[PDB]
Amino acid sequence: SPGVVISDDEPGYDLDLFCIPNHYAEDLERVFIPHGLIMDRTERLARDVMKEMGGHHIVALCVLAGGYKFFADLLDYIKALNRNSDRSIPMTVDFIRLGSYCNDQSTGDIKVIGGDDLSTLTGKNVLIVEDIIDTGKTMQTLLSLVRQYNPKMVKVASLLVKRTPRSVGYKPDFVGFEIPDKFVVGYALDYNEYFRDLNHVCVISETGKAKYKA
Amino acid sequence: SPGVVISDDEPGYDLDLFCIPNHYAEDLERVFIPHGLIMDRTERLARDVMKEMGGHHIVALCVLAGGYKFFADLLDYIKALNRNSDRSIPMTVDFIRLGSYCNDQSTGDIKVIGGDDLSTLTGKNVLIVEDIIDTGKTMQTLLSLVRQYNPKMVKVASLLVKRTPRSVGYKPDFVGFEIPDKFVVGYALDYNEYFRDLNHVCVISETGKAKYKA
Ligand SMILES: O=P(O)(O)OC[C@H]1O[C@H](OP(=O)(O)OP(=O)(O)O)[C@H](O)[C@@H]1O
Ligand SMILES: O=P(O)(O)OC[C@H]1O[C@H](OP(=O)(O)OP(=O)(O)O)[C@H](O)[C@@H]1O
Ligand SMILES: Oc1ncnc2c1N=NC2
Ligand SMILES: Oc1ncnc2c1N=NC2
Ligand SMILES: [Mg+2]
Ligand SMILES: [Mg+2]
């Protein structure tokens, strides 16, 4: 069950057919996933995490380090699906850090930095959430680590998956927009305190990255 | 300012004059504040917070146990003012706990259930967001902490300030409302993993109140 197939070629769109912010003009090359574009995916993607997990007291858990947004919305897009229909969705939140090699250079390590609180999770229906799923390196550790305790279930929803070759080949179970090995930002994809007000997941420029480097 | 302040004789509104979930029917008494009054009210706070705290870098940390939304939103509008205006304020967002109790009656305890990491909001105008200020035991503690590492500036946030005889005495720096002393649920206020898929901060009836007694 793939996702928004996006070949190594999708030209993208000009960054002047939308409302990108001036102070993010230089550092930007080409819009990728229009903001109103994403919403709709989740706007529907939430209507899946309900066709299986529906009739069960569900538990939502989010991976942090800068992944709030995509986390919120989807959740907001479920609260509604509870009321506006016959099939209930009683729930209990959850949160967790799991850190991240938060830069841009190429990928190889799993450094935890918080949010181990899961003792509870035991004996219940749980789904994870994440921005994105790059080389699935750290997530794996997570899912790995999300093997020790013991709950009723553990799917794995996520908006962005990466056809990065580094991928050990870990297919989640909820992928919004499958994409190529590149660097995107904006809308719960931040780059060291930047691009949090850019709703259009665009590709930072080989030059932009160079403005915010750590 | 306390902003949208509510007296006492406030009859809220009949839940039938608004769109409030079915099951969440019989369980509610009457409706306090509409979802709307918030979307718009909150929004403001962003434009108010934005002011005092403008061209800067602010660590937006929140407190946690059950409510994430309101905060989320309080960020959104903030995000926007930068893209829909001539201002910038790079941000950092931490997800604090000082975890709570979530109940009725008698007080006197504080034990952090995660999110412990105050070793970073240094020389920076922090950002603390509480879905609701009730007694003060938490914010007090936490407020009486961040000031330690010595952040550049501290400013409060509270969607709902709950006026009560039993109260710490404190006054958040940016209040949206100042609601009386009732058990309100909806929009980032909940009751033992219930009443969450309710945009309306309605009140819990003298029925559904005992429909999930602790
Ligand atoms: O599975 P992997 O290939 O090892 O990498 C995945 C991790 O990297 C991402 O970082 P993030 O630190 O970027 O935060 P941010 O979401 O805005 O950028 C994301 O949160 C993942 O946990
Ligand atoms: O009595 P006080 O000292 O004033 O305590 C206040 C806290 O307790 C409440 O519950 P809850 O923490 O469970 O929630 P959360 O994640 O949404 O804040 C509320 O959110 C306040 O933050
Ligand atoms: O900003 C980012 N931070 C961490 N990992 C990735 C990012 N963009 N693509 C992958
Ligand atoms: O009314 C309330 N309902 C749920 N939780 C809390 C409340 N006040 N403080 C915490
Ligand atoms: Mg992550
Ligand atoms: Mg709170």
DSSP string, B97-116: ------SSS--------S--
Chain B residues in contact with A82 by the CB 8 A cut-off are 21, 197
Residue B57 contacts A where some CB pair is shorter than 8 Å: yes
Dihedral over alpha carbons B18, B21, B27, B28 (to 10 degrees):
-20
**Bridge partners (DSSP) listed for residue A31:** A13
Residue B32 buriedness (CB in 10 A; 0-12 / 13-18 / 19+) = buried
Cα(A132)–Cα(A107) distance, rounded to whole angstroms? 14
Cα(B47)–Cα(B80) distance, rounded to whole angstroms? 10
B134 is an active site residue: yes
Closest atom of ligand 2 relative to the B101 alpha carbon: 13
- A62-63/A58-60 β-pairing: unpaired
DSSP assignment string, B50-76: HHHS-SS-EEEEE--SS--HHHHHHHH
B182: containing domain: 1-214
Angle at A57 between CA B111 and CA B24, to 5 degrees: 90
Question: Could you tell me the resolution of this structure in angstroms?
Answer: 2.7
How was this structure determined? It was done by X-ray
Closest atom of ligand 1 relative to the A185 alpha carbon: 17
Mapped onto helix, strand or coil, the DSSP state of residue B176 is strand
Buried-state track B178-192, b at ≥16 Cβ within 10 A, e below 16: bbeebebbbbbbbbe
Find the CATH number of the domain harbouring B108. Answer: 3.40.50.2020
**Bridge partners (DSSP) listed for residue B175:** B158
- Out of A21, A83, A97, the one facing B21 most closely (by C-beta) is A83
Buried-state track B105-136, b at ≥16 Cβ within 10 A, e below 16: eeeeeeeeebbeebeebeebbbbbbbbbbbbb
Q: Are A68 and B75 inside 8 Å of each other by CB?
A: yes
CA nearest ligand 4 atom 7, residue: B183
Residue B102 contacts A where some CB pair is shorter than 8 Å: no
Distance between B165 CA and the closest CA of chain A, angstroms? 31
Cα(B55)–Cα(B89) distance, rounded to whole angstroms? 5
Tokens of A34: 């229009």
Tell me phi and psi for residue B167, to 5 degrees.
-150, 140
Is A160 in contact with A132 (CB distance < 8 Å)? yes
CA nearest ligand 4 atom 2, residue: B183
A183 lines ligand 3 (CB under 6 A): yes
Q: Are B75 and A93 inside 8 Å of each other by CB?
A: no
Residue type, B38: I
Q: What number of CA atoms fall less than 13 Å from residue B207's CA on the CB side?
A: 9
Q: What number of CA atoms fall less than 13 Å from residue A173's CA on the CB side?
A: 14
Chain A residues in contact with B93 by the CB 8 A cut-off are 66, 68
Buried-state track B50-67, b at ≥16 Cβ within 10 A, e below 16: beebeeeebbbbbbbbbb
Contacts of A183 (CB under 8 A, 6+ apart): A104, A191, A203, A204, A209
Contacts of A86 (CB under 8 A, 6+ apart): none
Tell me phi and psi for residue A83, to 5 degrees.
-60, -60
Name which of A20, A35, A95, A192 to mutate to probe chain B: the one with the most chain B Cβ atoms within 10 A of its Cβ: A95
Tokens of A51: 């066709």
A172 lines ligand 1 (CB under 6 A): no
Distance between B197 CA and the closest CA of chain A, angstroms? 4
Cα(A141)–Cα(A125) distance, rounded to whole angstroms? 20
Angle at B82 between CA B81 and CA B86, to 5 degrees: 100
Domain tally for chain B? 1
Distance from residue A127's CA to the centre of ligand 2 (Å):
25
Active-site annotation holder among B9, B134, B181, B197: B134
Contacts of A76 (CB under 8 A, 6+ apart): B69
Interfacial B residues in 19-38 facing A (CB < 8 Å): 20-24
Mapped onto helix, strand or coil, the DSSP state of residue A40 is helix
Largest CA distance in chain B: 51
Q: Of A126, A150, A138, whose CA–CA distance to A97 is shortest?
A: A138
Is A155 in contact with A183 (CB distance < 8 Å)? no
Is B200 in contact with B34 (CB distance < 8 Å)? yes
Residue B55 contacts A where some CB pair is shorter than 8 Å: no
